[PDB]
Amino acid sequence: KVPPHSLEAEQSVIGGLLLDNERWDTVSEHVMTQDFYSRPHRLIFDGVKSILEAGKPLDLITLSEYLEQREQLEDVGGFAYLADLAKNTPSAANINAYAEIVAERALVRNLIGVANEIADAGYDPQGRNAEDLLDLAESKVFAIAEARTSENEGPKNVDSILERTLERIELLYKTPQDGVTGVNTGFTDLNKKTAGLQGSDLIIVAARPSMGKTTFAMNLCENAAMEQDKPVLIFSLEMPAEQIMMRMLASLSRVDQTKIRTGQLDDEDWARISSTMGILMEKKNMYIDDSSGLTPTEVRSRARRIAREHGGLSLIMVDYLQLMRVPALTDNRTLEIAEISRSLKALAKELNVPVVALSQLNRSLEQRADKRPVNSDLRESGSIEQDADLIMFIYRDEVYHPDSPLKGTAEIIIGKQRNGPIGSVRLTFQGHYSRFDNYA
């Protein structure tokens, strides 16, 4: 069987670039040295990539001298190969189209290389289980799909920006806003600044330990399961599915958590518990995943399952970003968090649903004396701010100071917002029932 490649297409990219150097700006955007099939073609392009990047003029002799010094000239096929290359394809402007068909053959070749990697790992497991082999197969397949999206990105001209900016103002003015657009948060004061939990964008809710990360995230999921028709998916890594349910019953029935974990509660308290269960089983939107160490592959497979089974998802939530692990970057922690954050943003776009990830801030804010959470304390964990579209921090002054002003009232300080503006929203926190309500 012959591998998918086109020798004429590889010759057309280099052959037409020797005559016109100006086309390199758009040609380099589509292909690289790795995309070329044969070894002499890879060696020739490796010189092209170096000469044209510096801004130096590229021709038949300038490229020949780069190969002659490295003694690759007699290896590629002498000067006769370079001479026949300039002679062939004297066409211009269509070089961008020639670069697309080189990337086309290379992508299929990379896909077969991954398909054979899965097959060889299947017959020869060497300790690898069915669960381990499933993650290895999907992670390698996603690498081709991830590389296919990193291309064509870069800076933007005013034409594309103005059209996108004016359309945003027009649609906002047209619709009767009332804050809500997309997914309802449940808080009127928050909806004014947030403009609802937008689809396909990554949301990170970060706070100091025992501030109420899981509490506030669940408080969003209470209203997300009630308001939105489509189901809500929750990945509980830290605490089990049972503990989440006790906090859920307390938030909706509005009866203290201490009464639930002990079991002692009167007939009056039981009536509020009874009313909660009824509304919960009418929609059945809530789904909890009580898994200790999830992989970015396992999150994708389980999200696709519920979306295919129940029409489609509405909101995905993660109990802990740090508790998630990647098998490839286990050694490097900085790259582990960077890839997990990159995988969660790509999962949001894949399903067009808001992803609410919970992350913890470094001890730097406690030493800082100000103790008001800043984005810099979260950068110490890994690359989160770059991938995130909306970052909101939970800060309760009653934690640091005993008789602090507005005791029992927390302020959700919005540290980052790509879509809208940044600020701070005060919400009354009821510790007993683990509820976040609108402050008046």
Ligand X SMILES: Nc1nc2c(ncn2[C@@H]2O[C@H](COP(=O)(O)OP(=O)(O)O)[C@@H](O)[C@H]2O)c(=O)[nH]1
Give yes or no for residue 360 binding ligand ALF (CB under 6 A). yes
Comparison of 213 and 230: residue with beta carbon closer to Mg ion:
213
Alpha-carbon distance of 109 to 114, in angstroms, equals 9
The interface partner of residue 174, options being its own copies, Mg ion, ligand ALF, none and the CB cut-off 5 to 8 Å by kind, is its own copies
* Contacting residues for 393 by C-beta, under 8 A, at least 6 apart: 205, 206, 207, 361, 373, 412, 413, 414, 415
**Selected range binding ligand X among 176-184, 340-348, 376-384, 411-419, rule: CB under 6 A:** 411-419
Residue 417 binds to Mg ion (criterion: CB under 5 A) = no
Binding string, 59-88, against its own copies, x = CB under 8 A? xxxx-xx--xxxx-------x---------
Tell me if 437 contacts ligand X by CB under 6 A. Answer: no
Site stretch for its own copies (CB under 8 A), options 37-45, 115-123, 216-224, 311-319: 115-123
Positions at the binding site for ADP: 210, 213-215, 247, 258, 396
Q: Taken in order 279, 280, 286, 292, is the CA torsion positive or negative?
A: positive
Q: Find the angle CA(254)-CA(257)-CA(260) to the nearest 5 degrees.
A: 100
Taking a C-beta distance cutoff of 8 angstroms, is the pair 217, 247 a contact? no
> Least separation, in Å, of the C-beta of 138 and its own copies?
6
Give me 347's structure tokens.
């999962």
Per-residue x/- marks for ligand X, 252-291, CB under 6 A?
Answer: ----xxx---------------------------------
How far apart (Å, rounded) are the C-alpha atoms in residues 253 and 433? 8
Partner in contact with 256, chosen from ligand ALF, ligand X, Mg ion, none, beta carbon below 5 to 8 Å by kind = ligand X
Give binding residues as ranges.
210, 213-215, 238, 247, 258, 319, 396
Residue 292 as a binder of ligand ALF (CB under 6 A): the answer is no
Helices and strands (DSSP H and E) totals, the chain: 19, 9
Applying the rule CB under 6 A, the residues between 60 and 89 that interact with ligand X are none
Member of 197, 343, 360, 410 binding its own copies (CB under 8 A): 360
CA separation, residue 361 to residues 52, 353, 364, 415, 431 (Å): 44, 25, 8, 13, 21
- Please identify, using beta-carbon distances, which residue of 9 and 211 lies nearer to ligand ALF: 211
Pairs from 48-56 (Cβ < 8 Å, separation ≥ 24): 48/14, 48/17, 48/24, 52/17, 52/21, 52/24, 52/28
Q: Does 70 bind ligand ALF (CB under 6 A)?
A: no
Binds ligand ALF (CB under 6 A): choice among 145, 386, 400, 407: 386
Binder of ligand X out of 4, 199, 312, 431 (CB under 6 A): 431
Q: Can you tell me the distance from the alpha carbon of 283 to that of 229, in angstroms, rounded to the nearest whole number?
A: 8
Q: Say which amino acid occupies 405.
A: P
1 is a contact residue toward its own copies (CB under 8 A):
yes
Q: In the 8-state DSSP scheme, what is residue 94?
A: T
214 touching ligand ALF, by CB under 6 A: yes
Q: Which residue is nearest to ligand ALF (CB)?
A: 209
Q: Which of 80, 157, 229, 440 binds its own copies (CB under 8 A)?
A: 157
> Under 8 Å CB-to-CB from 170, ≥6 apart: which residues?
none
Give me the 198-237 binding string for ligand X, x by CB under 6 A, dash otherwise: ---------x-xxxxxxx----------------------
- What tokens appear for 421 in the block? 């503006």
Residue nearest to Mg ion (CB): 214
In whole angstroms, the minimum distance from the beta carbon of 5 to ligand ALF comes to 44
Q: Which residue intervals of 254-400 are DSSP H helices?
A: 257-262, 267-283, 296-309, 333-351, 364-367, 376-379, 397-400
Shortest approach of ligand X to residue 418 CB, angstroms? 5
Q: Which amino acid is at 162?
A: L
Distance CA 305, CA 160 (A): 36
* Residue whose tokens read 């649609």: 171
The secondary element (H helix, E strand) that includes residue 194 is helix 188-194
Q: In angstroms, give the least distance from the CB of 152 to its own copies.
A: 9
420 is an interface residue for ligand X by CB under 6 A: yes
Contacts to Mg ion by CB under 5 A: 213-214, 238
Contacts to ligand ALF by CB under 6 A: 209-210, 213-214, 238, 360, 385-386, 418
